[PDB]
């Protein structure tokens, strides 16, 4: 549970940075510093926070690409029957939070673009709460919770990068196609040097640098092409996952939380928090997330399509759904993509609803499994 506490400290300092008179100002002007890269006729204009998030989430989703790959062949998602229960819980833990969010924001076309905000879950935070009181928590829950949030987080990035995304340059997709083609020929030829995949992945990440969501998917694509074979007792993807895990939990995610979880609390009132944008996220995370997860897990159990992990009780499942309401870093990153290049207060109001929703989802989920 070490990675969970060090993530809150980074968010707590970010709040102190954005609310103290001496720190706020330099904290806001730094994150909005223009960074213009000019290469001949080419020109990439992104602010400081954009360059930071495009690089941090690329490494974070590279670890996910390795984790998804070994879960899809060796873990819970390996077979179509074992993967039924986590996937069914994911579709429910998305359509119900979205409908609740859209129930509040259907009248405003600007805000209903972020319907995928209360559909994410901070994996490092949710695992941290479990590991906090996890002396004898059923190991199948951590496999279920990790697999449940992995599909909702990756699915949200794929959906955003397919429809609500802006089409990139034709030259960008051509290099991206060639970069994936090289990664494909590399895996088919049987090369196992992890750095060569990262070298080609850097070309893939650079070609789609203008789109933050495509540069994020570059990490997922590279993580899928890292070989997992166990030749001579060595695996590149298992070894790369072992190296990235401490760097992501102790540097990547803390830096992302310190640079995004900092909003000013001056002027925030109860009536302001009950408006459609923040309350829609609060209701989507605190209520919509456990409801859809509990409903779809239960519907699967009754209609014969379900599988059950070891020591299920199916009362711990809904408490996990409450713990899935901890969007935090993932929901903030989803909100940064949905509420980009629009009114600068949309992203601030979203972060207020995410943190209140995540803190309440953490305490309520803490109060149940503690009793169990």
Ligand X SMILES: CCCCCCCCCCCCCCCCCC(=O)OC[C@H](COP(=O)(O)OCCN)OC(=O)CCCCCCCCCCCCCCCCC
Ligand Y SMILES: CCCCCCCCCCCCCCCCCC(=O)OC[C@H](COP(=O)(O)O)OC(=O)CCCCCCCCCCCCCCCCC
Q: At which residue do the structure tokens 């944008």 appear?
A: 277
Residue 55, both tokens:
């690089």
Is residue 232 within the footprint of its own copies (CB under 8 A)? no
With respect to ligand Y, which residue has the nearer C-beta, 121 or 235? 235
The site map against ligand X for 205-244 (x = CB under 6 A) is --------------------------------------xx
The SS3 of residue 75 is coil
Residues 6 or more apart in contact with residue 271 via CB below 8 angstroms: none
**Partners of residue 329 on adjacent β-strands:** none
The site map against its own copies for 15-44 (x = CB under 8 A) is ------------------xxxxxxxx----
Q: Give 1's DSSP letter.
A: -
Backbone φ/ψ region at 39: left (φ over 0), alpha (ψ -120 to 50), beta: beta
Residue with the shortest CB distance to ligand X? 195
With respect to ligand CDL, which residue has the nearer C-beta, 240 or 277? 240
* Contact in structure between 340 and 131 (CB atoms under 8 Å): no
Please, what is the minimum distance in Å from the beta carbon of residue 35 to its own copies?
Answer: 5
103 binds, among its own copies, ligand CDL, ligand Y, none (CB under 5 to 8 A by kind): none
192 binds, among ligand Y, ligand X, ligand CDL, none (CB under 5 to 8 A by kind): ligand Y
Q: At which residue do the structure tokens 């879950």 appear?
A: 121
Instruction: Give CA–CA dist 42/62, Å, rounded.
Output: 27
Instruction: Give CA–CA dist 142/311, Å, rounded.
Output: 12
Please, what is the minimum distance in Å from the beta carbon of residue 238 to ligand CDL?
Answer: 9
Q: At which residue do the structure tokens 């969010």 appear?
A: 101
Point out which span in 131-139, 198-206, 286-294, 354-362 binds ligand X (CB under 6 A).
198-206
* Among residues 247, 272, 311, 313, the one that binds ligand Y under rule CB under 6 A: 247
DSSP 300-323: HHHTT-----TT-TTTHHHHHHHH
Please, what is the minimum distance in Å from the beta carbon of residue 186 to ligand Y?
Answer: 6
Task: State the residues that interact with ligand CDL by CB under 6 A.
Answer: 59, 193-195, 198-199, 202, 239-240, 243-244, 247
Task: State the residues that interact with its own copies by CB under 8 A.
Answer: 33-40, 48, 195, 243, 247
């Amino acid at each position: 549970a070490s990675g969970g506490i060090i993530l809150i400290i980074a968010a707590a300092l970010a709040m102190l940075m954005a609310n103290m008179g001496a720190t706020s100002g330099w904290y806001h002007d730094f994150l909005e510093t223009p960074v213009q890269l000019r290469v001949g006729a080419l020109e990439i204009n992104k602010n400081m926070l954009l360059w930071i998030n495009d690089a941090l989430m690329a490494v974070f989703f590279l670890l996910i690409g390795l984790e998804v790959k070994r879960e899809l062949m060796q873990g819970s998602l390996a077979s179509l029957r074992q993967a039924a229960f986590p996937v069914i819980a994911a579709i429910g833990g998305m359509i119900v939070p979205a409908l609740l969010y859209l129930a509040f924001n259907y009248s405003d076309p600007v805000t209903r673009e972020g319907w995928a905000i209360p559909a994410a879950t901070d994996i490092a935070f949710a695992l941290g709460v479990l590991a906090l009181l996890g002396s004898r928590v059923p190991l199948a829950l951590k496999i279920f919770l990790m697999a449940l949030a992995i599909i909702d987080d990756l699915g949200a990035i794929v959906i955003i990068a397919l429809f609500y995304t802006s089409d990139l340059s034709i030259v960008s997709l051509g290099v991206a196609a060639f970069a994936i083609a090289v990664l494909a020929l590399l895996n088919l030829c049987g090369v196992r040097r992890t750095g060569v995949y990262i070298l080609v992945g850097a070309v893939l990440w650079t070609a789609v640098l203008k789109s933050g969501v495509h540069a994020t998917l570059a990490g997922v694509i590279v993580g899928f092409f890292i070989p997992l074979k166990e030749k001579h007792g060595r695996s590149p993807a298992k070894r790369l996952e072992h190296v990235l895990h401490p760097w992501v939990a102790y540097l990547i995610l803390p830096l992302f939380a310190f640079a995004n979880a900092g909003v000013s609390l001056q002027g925030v009132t109860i009536d302001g928090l009950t408006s459609m944008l923040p309350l829609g996220i609060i209701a989507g995370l605190l209520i919509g997330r456990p409801l859809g997860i509990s409903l779809f897990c239960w519907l699967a159990l009754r209609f014969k399509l379900a599988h059950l992990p070891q020591g299920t009780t199916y009362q711990q499942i809904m408490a996990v759904g409450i713990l899935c309401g901890i969007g935090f870093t993932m929901s903030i990153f989803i909100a940064s993509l949905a509420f980009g290049n629009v009114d600068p207060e949309l992203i601030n109001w979203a972060k207020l609803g995410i943190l209140i929703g995540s803190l309440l989802s953490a305490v309520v989920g803490y109060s149940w499994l503690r009793a169990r």
